[PDB]
């Protein structure tokens, strides 16, 4: 069963470097060339690079020529894409893919993708604000606003995981400031607002920050 | 160099046949391959060498390359066929392959109006000299909304940040929108509103200081 496993993604500032890896299994590694194809947020597929089955040819898209290099280690069944002098427009999900034949053919197996984010923003923990229940049909909506953090991801639980039904945590928005915001809301019985405590647990691992915000 | 041209989008009713064209030069003499990419997933090969069907691809997907045009035909369309489809060639004379820009196939499914919840700024944020209104939009279908804000009855564009819709567990869509204000702007108006338009109908929620 052909299987491709990518790693090495992450978040960097412009001008820095990243090295992606593609670990292969289930085929004779050195009989196949390996490609990289990327996808900017919201946009189509863009071919990036190829290394030939025998490492004898390496080609790169004009958009990355001179900045990217590629290598293969047949001992470890792995391909490495070295990305130097990264630019914000290099932000993308990067896929490795196996080519069926020795050039001029098609990509028959694809990895699951490695996320690469190139941004001038600096790591920042969130400001968490309660979204208090106020004044639909016996149920109340309350939530927390997770404001101005960087980078993704943030996770949210309620009551340390004891409250799961009626929870909806929304995907974040990326703002013009370069920081993110997201919200999590739960619907509960109006009658419970005087007797039950509601706390949202916000975890931002990239800044080693956790916030437990009491709502109401 | 060579370019492959595909239509940006195709709409098709469940059970009907979708046809995606791929134009380029001298396709009589070249292989054209096709890839499927469903939202949030990696691409998958769905046609190789004009008409070959890869392992795991339904028989309803059929590639062809005839008269200089390559076509992916999806027969008896299912909702699960909603995806972006890309054609690809690799000329003898080119060091690298060429992809088309992709065709988005949407499958024509029970509509649902959005639920809208609007929260005013918290007192905590206001005493930190900031103000954010939060508009949460859930359970709508198809996945396209437009979001407008108003201060009293005047449209507001500055300070607005809105997500693109994303699919929920139940196959409906959700989105959110944020309006950033100064405290003085929040306190100086009678009300603010989040208006969500969907398939021509609007759901509007209002809050007041």
Numbering used by the authors:
A (entry chain H): 1 to 9, 11 to 30, 35 to 59, 62 to 72, 74 to 143, 147 to 227
B (entry chain L): 1 to 9, 11 to 29, 36 to 57, 65 to 72, 74 to 80, 83 to 125, 127 to 227
Sentences from the study reporting this entry:
The zoonotic Rift Valley fever virus (RVFV) can cause severe disease in humans and has pandemic potential, yet no approved vaccine or therapy exists.
The potent Gn domain A antibody, RVFV-268, did not block the interaction of LRP1 Cluster IV and Gn. We observed a stark reduction in the half maximal inhibitory concentration (IC50) value of the Fab of RVFV-268 compared to that of the IgG1 molecule. The F(ab′)2 form of RVFV-268 retained the potent activity of the full-length IgG1 molecule. This observation suggests that RVFV-268, which lost activity when the IgG form was converted to a Fab, uses a bivalent mode of binding to cross-link Gn protomers on the viral surface, concealing the access point by which the LRP1 receptor may be entering. RVFV-268 lost partial ability to bind to Gn proteins with T173L or E175G mutations and lost all capacity to bind to a Gn with K294E-D230N mutations. The relative protection conferred by the antibodies corresponded to the in vitro IC50 values for neutralization in that the more potently neutralizing the antibody, the lower the dose needed to achieve statistically significant protection in vivo.
